[PDB]
Amino acid sequence: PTITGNLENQTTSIGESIEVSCTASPQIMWFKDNETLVEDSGIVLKDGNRNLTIRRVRKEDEGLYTCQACCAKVEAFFIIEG
Amino acid sequence: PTITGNLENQTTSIGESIEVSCTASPQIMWFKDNETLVEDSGIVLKDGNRNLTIRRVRKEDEGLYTCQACCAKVEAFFIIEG
Secondary structure, eight states, X not given: OOOBSOOOOEEEETTOOEEXXXXXXXXXXXXXXXXXXXXXXXEEEETTTTEEEEOSOOGGXXXXXXXXXXXXXXXXXXXXXX | OOOBSOOOOEEEETTOOEEEEOBOOOOEEEXXXXXXXXXXXXXXXETTTTEEEEOSOOXXXXXXXXXXXXXXXXXXXXXXXX
């Protein structure tokens, strides 16, 4: 229940990358628009699911991303420009 | 001048991944349509540039990919279906 690390609102140009992370002082879980983050070839979780990377961001990536430690939470909205 | 590893022609559905590699018995370099492989957020070289990964493949990824050891070569054409 003590999350730290760079989950902040943010804007990215289409076709680029977003790299964020949460670290808790338990198991970290991720949501997009309050639903479990569907991993796909461009979405890669690392290191106990603390690092989230999205490659070749497209419009469908835009939304509200939550990283939860289970109970603490951080939310951030991602805008895809261009 | 002795390249080995899975550079073969291949078909992939749009939005998926391609993972190939060349390994020489010198420095490995990669081309697409005989031009230097422009790295972008979806194109990641690893391990001395022996592993090539493309995430969230799109139509523009389609083409002829060469891995050169400098002098040996392998070529493979990649079709993006769907």
